[PDB]
């Protein structure tokens, strides 16, 4: 219920203490959806390029619990 179009701020909310988990979604149309469970909202970020998605994934801090497609 919160769509994020800014990569950094998605990262910063991920670093924020309210963040509990992150999820990866790989759609058939080949876009990557980074969803970040927070305390109050779920912030999702849509990226159209695979390598930007991959560099984003490794940019997530290690302490965050990342989960693959459900």
Partner RNA sequence: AAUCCGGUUAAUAUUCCGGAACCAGAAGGUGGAAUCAACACGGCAACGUAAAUGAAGUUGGAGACGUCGGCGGGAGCCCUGGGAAGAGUUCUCUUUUCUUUUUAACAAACCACACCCUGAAAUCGGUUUAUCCGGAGCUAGGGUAUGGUGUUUGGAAGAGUUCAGCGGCUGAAUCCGGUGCGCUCUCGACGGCCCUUGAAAAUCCAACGGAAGUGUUUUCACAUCUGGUCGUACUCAUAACCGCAGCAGGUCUCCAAGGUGAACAGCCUCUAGUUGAUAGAACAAUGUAGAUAAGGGAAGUCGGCAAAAUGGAUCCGUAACUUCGGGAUAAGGAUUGGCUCUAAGGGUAUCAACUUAGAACU
**Contact map string, positions 1 to 40, toward RNA, x by CB under 7 A:** xxx------------xxx----x-x-xx----x-x-xxxx
Nearer of residues 28 and 58 to RNA, judged by Cβ:
28
| Maximum pairwise Cα distance, the chain | 33
Nearest approach, Cβ of residue 34 and RNA (Å): 9
Phi, psi of 49 (to 5 degrees): -115, 130
Phi, psi of 6 (to 5 degrees): -120, 125
41 binds RNA (CB under 7 A): yes
| Binding residues vs RNA (CB under 7 A) | 1-3, 16-18, 23, 25, 27-28, 33, 35, 37-42, 44, 46, 69-70
């Amino acid at each position: 219920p919160r769509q994020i179009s800014d990569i950094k701020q998605f990262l910063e909310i991920a670093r924020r203490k309210d963040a509990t988990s992150a999820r990866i979604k790989k759609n058939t149309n080949k876009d990557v959806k980074f969803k970040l469970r927070c305390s109050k909202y779920l912030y999702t970020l849509v990226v159209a390029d695979a390598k930007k998605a991959e560099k984003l994934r490794q940019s997530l801090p290690p302490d965050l619990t990342v989960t693959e497609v459900g």
